[PDB]
Amino acid sequence: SEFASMKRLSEIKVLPILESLKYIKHNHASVVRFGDGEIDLMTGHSIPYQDYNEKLAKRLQQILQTKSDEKLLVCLPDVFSNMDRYNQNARHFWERHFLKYSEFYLNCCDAPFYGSTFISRPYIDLIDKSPSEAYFESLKELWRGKDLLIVEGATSRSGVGNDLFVAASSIKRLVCPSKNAFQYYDEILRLTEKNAKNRLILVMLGPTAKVLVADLTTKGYQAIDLGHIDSEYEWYEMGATYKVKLTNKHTAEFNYDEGIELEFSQEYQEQIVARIG
Numbered sequence: 032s033e034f035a036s037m038k039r040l041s042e043i044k045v046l047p048i049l050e051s052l053k054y055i056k057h058n059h060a061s062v063v064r065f066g067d068g069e070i071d072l073m074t075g076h077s078i079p080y081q082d083y084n085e086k087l088a089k090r091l092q093q094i095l096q097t098k099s100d101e102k103l104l105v106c107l108p109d110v111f112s113n114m115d116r117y118n119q120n121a122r123h124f125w126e127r128h129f130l131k132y133s134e135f136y137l138n139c140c141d142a143p144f145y146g147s148t149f150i151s152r153p154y155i156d157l158i159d160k161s162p163s164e165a166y167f168e169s170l171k172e173l174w175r176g177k178d179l180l181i182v183e184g185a186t187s188r189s190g191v192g193n194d195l196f197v198a199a200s201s202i203k204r205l206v207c208p209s210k211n212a213f214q215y216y217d218e219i220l221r222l223t224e225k226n227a228k229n230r231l232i233l234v235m236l237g238p239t240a241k242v243l244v245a246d247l248t249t250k251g252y253q254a255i256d257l258g259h260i261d262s263e264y265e266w267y268e269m270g271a272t273y274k275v276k277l278t279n280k281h282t283a284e285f286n287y288d289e290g291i292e293l294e295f296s297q298e299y300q301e302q303i304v305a306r307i308g
């Protein structure tokens with residue numbers, strides 16, 4: 032009975048977006064998020080912007096086994112209870128996902144609580160988009176007045192052309208490959224450490240981001256895996272009802288990165304400390 036499995040998995044306890052944010056701020060915690068692509072990778076599959084890699088899969092598994100505490104919040108998709116928050120397409124996607132990974136989800140995740148992987152996904156799949164403004168305003172309090180190090184891909188351009196990070200005191204960016212970043216992992220970690228002094232680190236880098244956040248946290252940094260936050264903010268700012276493609280940068284779930292018409296944004300260019308790849 033697949034239904035039986037659905038009920039059993041509702042034993043997994045995720046702190047919803049706003050509650051996750053309170054945990055993060057109260058504890059100054061790093062944040063690592065596991066989504067469908069991470070489970071795909073951990074179980075042996077390649078995903079649109081990251082080929083399967085055995086070392087990556089192993090690290091992801093180790094990280095998911097780490098208990099959430101004062102230093103790190105480990106997050107899962109917030110779909111195990113109150114699935115009715117999400118639109119029909121999203122509900123179907125996620126149920127098929129966690130049923131397909133019954134073997135995995137049944138044995139992987141018996142921590143007392145997890146954060147929400149959807150702290151980066153606060154808008155587009157919701158039926159009631161009313162709390163979204165509150166979600167983004169709470170997110171923004173993470174970086175208001177902070178010096179940021181943003182580690183992201185060449186097409187991510189997080190906050191470029193919008194006001195998401197306007198209140199950050201400064202931004203430096205380590206710009207990595209838009210796909211298959213794990214290939215360059217050692218260099219990414221090395222340069223992130225070098226540039227992280229007195230900065231809050233934000234990471235938008237697919238599966239590679241999870242390892243980076245974990246390794247940085249072990250070395251004593253606060254690093255926050257924010258994934259596709261920019262896409263959701265862009266959709267939110269334009270009052271989108273569906274996932275419309277952005278023309279000037281990467282768009283979540285258009286992960287082949289086709290049809291992009293880049294611009295030269297001087298402010299963005301001046302923030303770039305180095306490119307990897």
Ligand SMILES: O=c1ccn([C@@H]2O[C@H](COP(=O)(O)OP(=O)(O)O)[C@@H](O)[C@H]2O)c(=O)[nH]1
Pocket residue numbers: 064066068080081151152183184185186187207208209210211212213235236237238239240257258259260281283
């Ligand atoms: O090798 C990679 C893998 C992904 N990304 C970027 O990682 C972000 C999405 O990360 P994640 O999959 O964690 O997002 P989520 O959907 O879970 O929020 C996007 O900006 C992608 O462009 C990247 O730059 N290089």
